[PDB]
Amino acid sequence: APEHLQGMVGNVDFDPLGLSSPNNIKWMREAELKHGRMSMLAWTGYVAVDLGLRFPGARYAELNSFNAHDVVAKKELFLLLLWVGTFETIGASQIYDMSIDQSERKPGDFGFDPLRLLKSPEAPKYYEAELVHGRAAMLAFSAVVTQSALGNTAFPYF
Amino acid sequence: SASFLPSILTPVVTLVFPGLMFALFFVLIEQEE
Amino acid sequence: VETMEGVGPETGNKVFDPVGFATLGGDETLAFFRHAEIKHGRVAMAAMVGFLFHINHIHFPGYLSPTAGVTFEQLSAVGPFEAWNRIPLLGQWKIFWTIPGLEHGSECLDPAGPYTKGGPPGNPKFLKNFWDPPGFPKKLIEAQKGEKLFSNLKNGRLAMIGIASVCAATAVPGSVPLLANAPALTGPGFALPFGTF
Amino acid sequence: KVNGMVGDCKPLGYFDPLGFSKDASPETMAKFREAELKHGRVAMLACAGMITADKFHPLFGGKLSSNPLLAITQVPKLGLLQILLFIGFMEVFGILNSRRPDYEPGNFLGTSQWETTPTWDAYQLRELNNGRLAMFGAIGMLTHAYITGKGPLELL
Amino acid sequence: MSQFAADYPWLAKYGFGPTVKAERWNGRHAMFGWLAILGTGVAKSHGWLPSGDVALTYNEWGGLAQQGFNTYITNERAIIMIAHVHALAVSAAAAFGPQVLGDSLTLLDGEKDEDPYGLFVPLKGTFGLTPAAEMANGRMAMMGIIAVVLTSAISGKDILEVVDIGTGGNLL
Amino acid sequence: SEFVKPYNNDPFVGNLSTPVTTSTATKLYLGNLPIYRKGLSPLLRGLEIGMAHGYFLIGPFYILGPLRNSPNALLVGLFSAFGLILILTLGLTIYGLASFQGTEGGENLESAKGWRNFTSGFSIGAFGGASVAYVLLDNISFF
Ligand code: CLA
Ligand code: CLA
Ligand code: CLA
Ligand SMILES: CCCCCC(=O)OC\C(C=C=C1C(C)(C)C[C@H](OC(C)=O)C[C@@]1(C)O)=C/C=C/C(C)=C/C=C/C=C(C)/C=C/C=C(\C)C(=O)C[C@@]12O[C@]1(C)C[C@@H](O)CC2(C)C
Ligand SMILES: CC1=C(C#C/C(C)=C/C=C/C(C)=C/C=C/C=C(C)/C=C/C=C(C)/C=C/[C@@]23O[C@]2(C)C[C@@H](O)CC3(C)C)C(C)(C)C[C@H](O)C1
């Protein structure tokens, strides 16, 4: 069991390389959760586009997820860049405040619970489900993009 | 090859050195007892 | 709590809840789900009446933007969900900018608060004379309008099913057996806002 | 000045038929005065803008005079976004003024701190009357520009 | 140490001068620059993209064109310079930015400099991502840079090619 | 009426309560800027000042610089903005060194810790704002 800084959601004390200082634990959890959420969305989008979902229009059809990035970068991905940056700025405010001071704001808790699903009695299970799905989706998206980069794109990527 | 020394030394000396000297001199001016 | 409304006959007089959903959150989640269900129902009933008007060729005796040249006559010549693609480009802006105004007012200006915290879901009666510009319910008793709200919910669910069937039949042929083939219901099967985006 | 509010001009006095201000909270009066003053200021800006842009439009070149055509023939989308951003900034400041516990309704100058005379009420009434006149004038100008296709200094 | 602390108290307060922080940072920079030297050796090997025969015209680069002895600055030196400028901009953002996840470049308010000393910094028993081992690696990297500079200066060969003697068939 | 009165009810302080100094509009503007907004750590104040300033500073170098009529105009403007941002950061650090010495620190801006946090926030925000305006200027045909 590496140090006493562990003891939260999704902790099996797996740290062989020892990349966990007493300070770099909250930032580590925040980075892991951000990567996991972006990987869940990325894998779902890659699979759904390669499965048959298309934006209605002749431009966005006849395009797989592999060759979509260099076509819509200057026109359609720019809007996504603007919106993602707009959200990431307020995220940066909260993250930097949490990093220097502010003894609240657990890593990942952006307050984006509009429906207020944390009032359910299954909220800790929601926490570990989010973390497990984030890890599985980071592995899944890395698998999908590295397999589709090696020739065989298709749907199943093998 | 001695054709690089003007373009290396002249900016380094003329810009970087007196800027650091001005900052250091100002700090040494305003330190008190 | 799953006492609420919408539980009656032809479902066992108990909550129809295979998947959790109702217990996915708390009381406020149920209020949000009920407001979504009621708003969805009302939109589906309105869409069904508008679609029935469109099929029977009941259009306004006007012009609809003489500058563009579109008229009410050739908005009924095309099928459903293609008429929305032909409503110029300012008309979609105006229909939209009217509808967020109603949404923002229907959530914000509640003397009791949002439906999740104080106030029943599906109640924009604080917008004065919005639901009832004439009287219609003005002398109805509370026990009557409770049953009327129950009928509202049931008809909304049926209208949701019907408009899903209409969209499927216009999109994927042979989906709805009674619809099967039709002279109308020929089009894209969906409408994007502002036509293409 | 009735109920602590300026107004009440000579040609027609306390102009409240239909009873909009009978038995109403001071918050409702503040909201009504804010609406009236903001309408008046927007309409004075609108009337002066159509009048000036009918004959003096040097900012882009040849740019027509039918006012609904003015907003669409050019004024690229960045310009409309910048106008909307400016107006949204001023409206956010209006909200922040409305949350203060010294809120005279249409007041951004915060004149409760300074001493006021009836000349101040007279100038407030001048602003209100000019605002109402520009309300009617702006609606009329937009209606003419739709019906005929000409601006205010045109059509004559 | 105390000689330099008494000689330059303002400079030794912030950890500048012959301190352990300075030597650790210089060792890290020597490690990354060894990686950069190897990468530029691969760059001349494969010819990934930059060509170092063409010139930089005035009409596209201003006074940062012809500068030394009315001699042209080449595209290879310009490309490596642009990469170095971007590295320096990231460096300035890290030095003058929020002190997150990082050892600070300078010493903060009244904190004492660390001391893993030196001498031989025992490699056995300090394996992994330990400060003593990283310290040893940076020290060896600085000595490698000094040795390569001296060997290239004595032999009259290219600094990127004086290490090509000690590799054999590698990259370029 | 009288719209110019003694400032803060003191007739002998060297200021006046004009409609420019003590209006509610000016208080709302200059009480909600990052340097004056309530409940802000000095790092966030510096960050919010810095991004606007970097956006600003990459403004004039690209259009009016010596390499304006060059294919490398925007890159040179970005580098010039980076250099000016570095100079301003150095000036902020030396001002903090000369002004705040032997201070207790804390969340106050007028201290060593507060000014170091403010300078760090300004530097990272200024570099970020210059980069963001570079990205927006490189794809200006999108708007
Ligand atoms: C006092 C005498 C003196 C003066 C006025 C200059 C003037 C100049 N030299 Mg220079 N130089 C000198 C002596 C001097 N040199 C000596 C003795 C050497 C042999 C080491 C050199 C070697 C040299 C090189 C290799 C280069 C220059 C270059 C230059 C030019 C750009 C400035 C620069 O980067 O200098 C940098 C100079 C140095 C790093 C060497 C130190 C110069 C002397 C030793 C310092 C004397 C200080 C003096 C007494 C003033 C004291 C007060 C001062 C602190 C304010 C400038 C015309 C550059 C050039 O040609 O540009 C076109 C260039 O590349 N110099
Ligand atoms: C929408 C704009 C608007 C609003 C919010 C107000 C609000 C107010 N006015 Mg006011 N006024 C307006 C426009 C407006 N006015 C115009 C245009 C004129 C010129 C005729 C006047 C002339 C006027 C006088 C002379 C006096 C007031 C007074 C008042 C205050 C108390 C009366 C009251 O309760 O009105 C509440 C008003 C509303 C709730 C707005 C009703 C909007 C209806 C729905 C409009 C219906 C259509 C309309 C009849 C015709 C427009 C269409 C036409 C272009 C074809 C109150 C703050 C009195 C005052 O200041 O007391 C101290 C007073 O003496 N007003
Ligand atoms: C004598 C020393 C010296 C040197 C070497 C330079 C060098 C330069 N000046 Mg400059 N200048 C100086 C003194 C000097 N200046 C003085 C004393 C004045 C006041 C009279 C000026 C006023 C001045 C103006 C008004 C302008 C220049 C410009 C330029 C650039 C020429 C245009 C070009 O090709 O690059 C184009 C520029 C780039 C490719 C960007 C390079 C990125 C920066 C400069 C590198 C970072 C340097 C770093 C921050 C230094 C830190 C110093 C600090 C430690 C104290 C070049 C970087 C022009 C310029 O910068 O273009 C925008 C310009 O417009 N200069
Ligand atoms: C449009 C902005 C409206 C501002 C907002 C507003 O006032 O809201 C009111 C509103 C909706 C709403 C709501 C209510 C339900 C009523 C109330 C809710 O209350 C709450 C709190 O919930 C809020 C809201 C928003 O939900 C909608 C108002 C819509 C409005 C006022 C729409 C004007 C169109 C004029 C056109 C299309 C002219 C075309 C002119 C065209 C196309 C021309 O070609 C002109 C032409 O010259 C050209 C260019 C060349 C010439 O040669 C030829 C001619 C002369 C022909
Ligand atoms: C003990 C003592 C004495 C002594 C002594 C001695 C022998 C002192 C010796 C000191 C010595 C020998 C100090 C070497 C430093 C080497 C450095 C800093 C290398 C940095 C190199 C760095 C930081 C990396 C740079 C680059 O990576 C960059 C950034 C980009 C790359 O593209 C290029 C490279 C890789 C180059 C005296 C004289 C007897 C007097 C008194 O008694 C005290």
Side-chain angles (χ1 to χ4, degrees), chain A residues 26 94-105, chain F residues 41-42 44 107:
Chain A
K26 291 178 169 179
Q94 293 188 11
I95 278 163
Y96 287 148
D97 207 21
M98 183 278 288
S99 177
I100 53 170
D101 52 2
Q102 202 202 1
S103 83
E104 69 275 16
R105 172 58 181 78
Chain F
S41 71
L44 302 185
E107 275 185 345

Side-chain angles (χ1 to χ4, degrees), chain A residues 55-57 60 115-122 126, chain C residues 23-29 32-33 116-117 192 196:
Chain A
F55 277 169
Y60 315 105
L115 263 71
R116 296 177 187 272
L117 290 185
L118 287 174
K119 209 164 74 73
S120 62
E122 292 182 354
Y126 292 162
Chain C
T23 175
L24 191 73
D27 291 331
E28 295 155 335
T29 62
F32 185 82
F33 284 160
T116 57
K117 182 178 54 181
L192 272 76
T196 57

Side-chain angles (χ1 to χ4, degrees), chain D residues 128-148:
Chain D
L128 272 167
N129 286 332
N130 276 268
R132 298 149 173 167
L133 187 57
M135 293 176 70
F136 275 118
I139 293 300
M141 270 172 204
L142 291 179
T143 303
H144 312 148
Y146 178 66
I147 293 298
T148 71

Side-chain angles (χ1 to χ4, degrees), chain C residues 31-92:
Chain C
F32 185 82
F33 284 160
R34 184 45 61 94
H35 197 87
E37 176 185 28
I38 293 178
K39 193 171 295 187
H40 274 86
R42 290 160 169 181
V43 165
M45 318 171 54
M48 185 63 72
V49 172
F51 169 71
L52 282 183
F53 267 66
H54 179 86
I55 296 309
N56 304 319
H57 296 70
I58 309 175
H59 56 81
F60 277 141
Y63 211 98
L64 192 148
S65 85
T67 303
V70 190
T71 79
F72 287 100
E73 189 71 62
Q74 69 268 19
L75 272 188
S76 65
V78 302
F81 300 106
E82 190 62 33
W84 185 271
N85 296 332
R86 294 180 67 188
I87 304 172
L89 189 146
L90 305 174
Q92 287 136 352

Side-chain angles (χ1 to χ4, degrees), chain D residues 77-78 81 89 93 96-97 100 102 107-111 113-117 119-120, chain F residues 1-5 17-20 22-29 32 140 142-143:
Chain D
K77 304 199 284 295
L78 277 178
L81 283 187
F89 208 52
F93 277 127
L96 293 183
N97 188 23
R100 293 171 60 93
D102 60 356
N107 203 313
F108 290 93
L109 209 70
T111 48
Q113 49 183 337
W114 300 297
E115 274 62 5
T116 66
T117 45
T119 67
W120 173 236
Chain F
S1 52
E2 182 78 277
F3 289 154
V4 176
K5 72 176 182 64
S17 178
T18 74
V20 179
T22 42
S23 285
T24 55
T26 77
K27 287 180 216 156
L28 286 179
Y29 189 64
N32 292 304
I140 199 62
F142 172 74
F143 311 96

